[PDB]
C-alpha cells in the first residue's frame, strides 16, 4: 500500500510538481496562493489531457 | 528569506493542503492527477476570494 502510493507519486512527478509549487508560492508571495496553486495545476492539467 | 517561506507557508496552512492532496491522489489513485490537483485547489480558490 505504501509502495503503491510511492510508486504513483514517483510515476507522476508528484513530489517535483510540488517542490516547484512551494518554491514559486516562496519565492512570488502570492496575495492569492490559493488562485496561484489552481492555475499551476490548471496549466499541466492542460498537457495532461493534450 | 528563508524564515520568511517558513512564515508564508505556516499562515496559508501550505504544508496540510498539500500532504492532504497527496493522501487523496494516493487514495484516490486518479487516472488524472494533474486534473484532481487542479479541481482541489479551485475549490480552495472559491473560499480564497469569497
Not at 9 to 30: E, F, G, M, Y
Request: charged share 35%; aromatic share 8%.
Amino acid at each position: 500500500s505504501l509502495r503503491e502510493c510511492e510508486l504513483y507519486v514517483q510515476k507522476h512527478n508528484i513530489q517535483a510538481l510540488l517542490k516547484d509549487s512551494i518554491v514559486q508560492l516562496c519565492t512570488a508571495r502570492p496575495e492569492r496562493p490559493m488562485a496561484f496553486l489552481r492555475e499551476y495545476f490548471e496549466k499541466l492539467e492542460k498537457e495532461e489531457a493534450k
